[PDB]
């Protein structure tokens, strides 16, 4: 069976976080619970790290622990708006393969200008809230 879980990550003062937190930002470590060998984190590059992704926020799921062996997981990321609604969701279509220190995700998860345009309601009080759902086989 599948073990489905989630993590909600709030990055405060998002508009300054490249200065205050750096080029790459790792979340706190999380898992499904206390009955779980697996430890994961999210990694964000508030500006993508090559010519092509420079206008995008990049978002990855990183396996931090040293598990039994290879882990195969599906993942879904989305952005929670001002109203508490999930938007801009994208999915791994299949299960990717993680070993300790391996990440998978989207180098171009979302355009910064989309995110920064206040009409879109994605940075209420300059807080970016990301929702990650993970599904381990």
């Amino acid at each position: 069976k599948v073990v489905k879980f989630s993590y909600m990550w709030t990055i405060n003062n998002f508009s300054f976080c490249r200065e205050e937190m750096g080029e790459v930002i790792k979340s706190s470590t999380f898992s499904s619970g206390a009955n779980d060998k697996l430890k994961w984190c999210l990694r964000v590059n508030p500006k993508g790290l090559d010519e092509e992704s420079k206008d995008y926020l990049s978002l990855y799921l990183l396996l931090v622990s040293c598990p039994k062996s290879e882990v195969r997981a599906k993942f879904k990321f989305s952005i929670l708006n001002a109203k508490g609604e999930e938007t801009k969701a994208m999915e791994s279509q299949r299960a990717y393969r993680f070993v300790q220190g391996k990440d998978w995700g989207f180098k171009k998860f979302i355009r910064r200008d989309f995110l920064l345009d206040e009409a879109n309601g994605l940075l209420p009080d300059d807080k970016l809230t990301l929702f990650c759902e993970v599904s381990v086989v």
């Binding site: 990694r43 990855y60 998978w104 995700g105 989207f106 180098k107 171009k108 355009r111």
Partner: peptide, 10 residues
Amino acid sequence: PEQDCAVTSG
């Protein structure tokens, strides 16, 4: 593209 669904590793 407002989002790009290509999955890569870091």
